[PDB]
Ligand binder design. Structure first.
Ligand SMILES: CC(C)CCC[C@@H](C)[C@H]1CC[C@H]2[C@@H]3CC=C4C[C@@H](O)CC[C@]4(C)[C@H]3CC[C@]12C
Ligand SMILES: CC(C)CCC[C@@H](C)[C@H]1CC[C@H]2[C@@H]3CC=C4C[C@@H](O)CC[C@]4(C)[C@H]3CC[C@]12C
Ligand SMILES: CC(C)CCC[C@@H](C)[C@H]1CC[C@H]2[C@@H]3CC=C4C[C@@H](O)CC[C@]4(C)[C@H]3CC[C@]12C
Lengths: 366, 366, 366
């Protein structure tokens, strides 16, 4: 043979031994994929159906403002990490009673970017977005900044809303009391009417308070929002609002309107990873070979067999660690790196044709 | 689904990573279970048959005193640890010529308690007890205190004897000459006649000397016992006894009686873990699935294949480490935590019905 | 049973845990056995066919001098270690056009001694020898001294040549620029005519220069050799030679004769471990079960599957580590520890009968 049928210091060989050394334990993990944890945004989809039927934009704004708060609400007492989705992992949930269907494909493992797309069962809204959790270690706590723009298209009103979820932080992680706190600044934009809803998730510095307002294009406060993201959210007149001025309730301003309050967790919550009645349904047979319900890493943990799922986590990570190396010589099956049509940021637009059962060449993640 | 089909800090997660980190090498081990090492008490069963036929209680006491010494005698030059019996492990030995049959089930792995029961082939005695070795590290040596009461029921005389084996110590273990020494205080009680036999296993401080006496209920020395537990044991008159007063023989007092002396080890001893002619028989097909002869950990080591048995030790320990966790959501098959009927201490009474071949639901240890 | 069917401190048990702790990574390795790396001596076999046809001994000496230089010439830019041959590993190469056939059996793993034997296709020469690489770590470099005597028997002239390859050194290995250098002193002896060819592989201290001379029995310089082992080798008159007097050409003395120059490496060299056009042929079905082409450790690395070959390296080393222990209760199949018939050193004489396809009881290395 003329040549070969294949091609090609100690410290340099050591920088490769350290870069390859990555693993993951399975105890801080909870029996849910991150695609399933993000699916909890649709827990209060009724606020979207309520928003698409109101003829007043500021009343639509209150519902979208309440929906954004209700989406990040179920993150209380749930100090369990979701399974980091393997490259190509997908998930779908069709709630017949709530009236929505959602797709979510793990579109990137480096960085761990997750893209999703949801649509109304009666063609009333379209909900999609992408989230990349940037984990920051600092002091005795750990932050997690959900990088990405959320998009809610109100179909029958020919409008769309965009905002950014606030930063989630896990306090006292070294040797203390784990309690989750969410803070940051959320701004919702009505791209048709020009209405902006500013929301200020206050920090422990008063613990889970959320204060904000809703204004128009001329920048005039129309409603004053207040409450706690672990309890409720109110909408009171702005004039009467300004006239009022593991750490451990809300003060109802006269003339307030209860936009939304938390649904009580089922009795099975305290001893089952503090799940909500909606979260315990995330996990028949026509599902694709990539749906995380088929992931034996998450599945084996759900049956109580701990050590069985821990090895299959190392197994599935090792296959993803090996198949990624063989591709140096990836195809996003349901999303394409397209710009967000309302704000311009590089989003992940839903390609389509997923609800057609005819598909082939889906990667073999597990 | 309403709920789930299964239920549920870093430093706290580290105390679990350290508590779970337990393993065991297989080189200090010797190809014998601890149930087999303890079976060597019956090596000199003839002293029991000799005891049940004598009409003099103090002559019966001398034999039981000699039997207790002969039981811990074979522990010389045998610096090899026996295989720690897995939970539920059993062993049985029926010597047709010696005239006894013995059962021993590993009744507890935490703490490592071993319970046994032996009976005479001609219905002349009943021998049972429980032993828990408490290992103490100190200085450049290692002790092992056999916690538990030995019980010898002389059937035809309607009497029973009870005593406690002395502490075994392994000197010079770090980087020195391993030599076994046994010291402590043993007291044998004749619960029918009130005779007490005190035995003082002297320590290296003279090396393996054993001095003692036999007295009645009125506390009067009847016989004076002396000798070495690695050699012999004599019974001389108490009056003429008091008139006489790897480290490296006995002085026969005038008027002495040789109660017992050691049997010479076979020539195959020096190059086969210093076993005795009785110990090399401990390891046909109607044996239960728990008999340690069926343990592949001990078995593979007996054939010379070292590395084969070392992995199966890790395998059998890992199965015991996994099956114990699945029971948090044990059944002693042949012993029940009953009090010793002669002294009152919490012993392990032999339940019975073992010699009936009909049995089911025996745990799958290997 | 009378006895057993098998025979037999912490710090002493630790000296065994450290002596057994040996492994090997597979990245510095290159997809070639050391038996194949040494086979590159025959890359310029034409110099041997040219030597056996010349009627002048000093012209034969120049060719053997040029052949010895050309043998260690292909070690440039090849900073990849060959696979350490397992005990009993063999290799054979029959180049029909070059006119030679060579056998090489890994005759010893401790120390790693490799023995080979080559013969001319037209019965013109016999080439054999043994090499043991003594690895020395020093400073920021690593040496490798090829211990062993090379033997070239010129058949039709009834003479034989013997010499020793120079020391190979790998500079700047810690965290620097890996570049190979060969230095030492090589002396070729014509045992029939008494001619001696001294070769001085100069060191970096001028980088790869090689200066030497050829003298007779009366110790008189007949030819003066100069050049670089990575370029060429010349033979000029000794009188006109003395009249001339990652670090980074030759000066052609008037009246010089080009004995040999390097063959240009194929274009596939730079991105395929810097192999030569001859080296890329070392790796149909009548080959014995020991030929390193059948070694899956070297084979799997040749197909590009890296991690597949890395485990099979640990596998094949573990089998060699286990089969060597079972022999304490080895047979060299093609060489016998016989003294070299020309200089007297303990060589490895080729037994014979290898080219007969009838053979049995070859060890199962993989
Ligand atoms: C302590 C370690 C080992 C495990 C716990 C880390 C967990 C609590 C971290 C890792 C990633 C984080 C999540 C990243 C993304 C979101 C989406 C956001 O809209 C709500 C918060 C939420 C859900 C974060 C909650 C906290 C989180 C789940
Ligand atoms: C050095 C380590 C790793 C291995 C050696 C430990 C061995 C020698 C220890 C561990 C448990 C100990 C045994 C525990 C129980 C008994 C029963 C008693 O009636 C005689 C002594 C005897 C038999 C002990 C002898 C010494 C012993 C076997
Ligand atoms: C850096 C480490 C991990 C791997 C690299 C070590 C390599 C370069 C070393 C190990 C053994 C050495 C070889 C030992 C034997 C010979 C035969 C001699 O006639 C030419 C040099 C040669 C071919 C040496 C070249 C350098 C060598 C191949």
């Amino acid at each position: 043979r003329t040549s070969l049928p294949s091609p090609m210091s100690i410290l340099r060989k050591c920088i490769g031994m350290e870069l390859s050394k990555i693993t993951m334990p399975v105890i801080f993990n909870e029996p849910l994929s991150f695609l399933q944890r993000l699916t909890e945004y649709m827990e209060h989809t009724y606020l979207i159906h309520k928003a698409s039927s109101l003829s007043d934009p500021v009343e639509r704004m209150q519902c979208v403002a309440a929906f954004a708060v209700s989406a990040v609400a179920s993150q209380w007492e749930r100090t369990g990490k979701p399974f980091n989705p393997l490259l190509g992992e997908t998930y779908e949930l069709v709630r017949d009673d709530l009236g929505f269907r959602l797709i979510s494909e793990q579109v990137s493992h480096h960085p761990p970017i997750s893209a999703f797309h949801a649509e109304g069962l009666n063609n009333d809204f379209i909900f999609h977005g992408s989230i990349y959790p940037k984990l920051k270690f600092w002091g005795k706590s750990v932050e997690a900044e959900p990088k990405g723009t959320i998009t809610l298209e109100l179909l029958e009103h020919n409008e769309a809303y965009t905002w950014t979820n606030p930063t989630c932080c896990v306090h006292n992680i070294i040797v203390g009391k784990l309690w989750i706190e969410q803070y940051g600044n959320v701004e919702i934009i009505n791209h048709k009417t020009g209405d902006k809803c500013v929301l200020n998730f206050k920090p422990c510095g008063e613990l889970h308070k959320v204060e904000g307002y809703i204004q128009d294009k001329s920048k005039k406060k129309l409603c004053a929002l207040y409450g706690k993201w672990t309890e409720c959210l109110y909408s009171v007149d702005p004039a009467t609002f300004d006239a009022y001025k593991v750490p451990d309730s809300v003060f109802i301003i006269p003339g307030s309107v209860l936009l939304w309050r938390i649904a009580p967790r089922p009795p099975n919550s305290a001893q089952m990873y503090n799940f909500t009645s909606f979260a315990m349904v995330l996990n028949e047979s026509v599902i694709p070979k990539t749906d995380c319900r088929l992931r034996p890493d998450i599945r084996a943990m759900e049956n109580g067999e701990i050590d069985q799922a821990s090895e299959e986590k190392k197994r599935l990570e090792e296959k993803q660690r090996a198949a990624r190396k063989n591709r140096s010589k990836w195809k996003t099956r349901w999303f394409h790196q397209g710009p967000n049509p309302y704000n311009g940021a590089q989003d992940w637009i839903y390609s389509g044709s997923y609800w057609d059962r005819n598909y082939f060449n889906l990667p073999d993640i597990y």
